[PDB]
Design a protein around this ligand. Structure first.
Ligand SMILES: NC(=O)c1ccc[n+]([C@@H]2O[C@H](COP(=O)([O-])OP(=O)(O)OC[C@H]3O[C@@H](n4cnc5c(N)ncnc54)[C@H](OP(=O)(O)O)[C@@H]3O)[C@@H](O)[C@H]2O)c1
Ligand SMILES: O=C(O)CCC(=O)c1ccc2c(c1)OCCCO2
Ligand SMILES: [Co+2]
Length: 159
């Protein structure tokens, strides 16, 4: 099982300036629950976005995808191809935009947090991947984050 997990604005923006223009504590707990115990695969830029005191994320096989053969990610594995990282029963791709696109052929689940924030796409933004007709979606109710933004969870899946 390869799954993708991400939060996006209604516009599809997931990242800007190397970070994320919101923060939902409820989404971070949801992320931790879904990924805990499993492999997490991330692009090098997303590894960079994590503070050093946070990496690796605890209780998970942290895998960083990079083309630099000497890139050092302390506490993590660095692989040069996505296929290298798929040696566990559950693998969650945690971003960012480039790695979601690379991983989507392998994926049968997307746990998507839609954040009710009006955020026009700008040059250089990272974007959510486009899900084609093979994906079946189930939606939750709109909920209020304590940060003041509404959000809702979509669970997409396909055989
Ligand atoms: N909203 C969310 O839920 C969420 C979650 C995660 C990240 N984000 C945001 O997304 C943004 C980063 O996403 P990004 O698309 O800019 O970069 P990214 O996907 O996180 O990492 C890009 C890097 O991955 C490596 N890479 C990409 N394709 C590869 C391949 N085919 N083989 C080997 N290595 C490969 C390269 O690393 P080298 O350059 O080292 O080769 C590339 O520079 C940040 O803003 C981050 O905050 C958002
Ligand atoms: O998982 C934990 O241990 C606590 C929450 C956390 O560390 C976290 C939550 C969301 C993330 C993230 C980390 O980095 C990946 C890119 C953005 O999505
Ligand atoms: Co689990």
């Amino acid at each position: 099982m390869v799954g993708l997990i991400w939060a996006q604005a209604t516009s599809g923006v997931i990242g800007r300036g190397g970070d994320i223009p919101w923060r939902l504590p409820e989404d971070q707990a949801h992320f931790r629950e879904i990924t805990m115990g499993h492999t997490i695969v991330m692009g090098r830029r997303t590894w960079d976005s994590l503070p050093a005191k946070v990496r690796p994320l605890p209780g998970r096989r942290n895998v960083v995808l990079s083309r630099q053969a000497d890139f050092m990610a302390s506490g993590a594995e660095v692989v040069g191809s996505l296929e290298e990282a798929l040696t566990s029963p559950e693998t969650w791709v945690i971003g960012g935009g480039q790695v979601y696109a690379l991983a989507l052929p392998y994926a049968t689940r997307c746990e998507v947090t839609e954040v009710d924030i009006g955020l026009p796409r700008e040059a250089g933004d990272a974007l959510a991947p486009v899900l084609d007709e093979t994906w079946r979606g189930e939606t939750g109710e709109w909920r209020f984050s304590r940060s003041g933004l509404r959000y809702r969870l979509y669970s997409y899946h396909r055989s």
